[PDB]
Ligand SMILES: O=C(O)CCC(=O)C(=O)O
């Protein structure tokens with residue numbers, strides 16, 4: 669099987685993230 | 689935009705729980721949609737876009753996977769005020785969905801990905817947005833292509849919702865808002881685009897999954 673993370677759109681894992 | 693409470697509880701929530709995909713057409717109206725288009729075109733014209741990237745990078749060029757160019761927008765930047773209004777309207781809908789979208793607890797989101805497929809047959813191969821638990825639970829996309837004729841310019845987002853007898857073809861229509869579960873239930877592809885195609889995505893996080901993903905990242 670294929671590692672699907674190699675096709676997945678990047679998002680920052682560092683920093684915060686925006687809080688709702 | 690329409691009153692968030694009713695749109696969220698009476699349309700978005702049931703549509704998402706039954707189908708995992710929800711289309712809201714004519715979300716913000718023509719005037720606001722055109723203002724967003726002008727802000728996006730200004731980002732494009734001033735060289736802000738860079739090659740779209742992938743979660744994990746192996747030997748392959750990113751352009752063999754996704755052919756778009758993007759920039760990340762927080763919402764308060766000068767010249768992005770209407771994009772900021774879009775993001776706040778998305779957020780308002782999600783907040784009115786609190787605790788009603790599956791079992792998720794949505795507490796946060798990414799910045800907005802402003803993305804352009806610059807024609808020339810560019811697209812995005814079939815993929816899952818969040819295949820291995822990075823916290824993303826809802827993908828939210830706003831399309832802003834006035835005059836798009838998909839039969840000639842392509843660029844259809846085709847989603848293959850798991851277990852369904854038909855796939856879901858989403859034309860990147862002006863002022864269309866789209867939600868879908870980001871996990872493996874919704875593999876999808878952007879079919880080749882033959883004109884300049886714009887869309888703005890935010891991903892909403894499930895609190896517990898996102899915490900687990902952050903722990904994994906912070907521990908190596
Ligand atoms: O623009 C679209 O319709 C979808 C883009 C997409 O699938 C992505 O960037 O992950």
Ligand SMILES: [Fe+3]
Nearest residue numbers: 677816817876
């Ligand atoms: Fe995607």
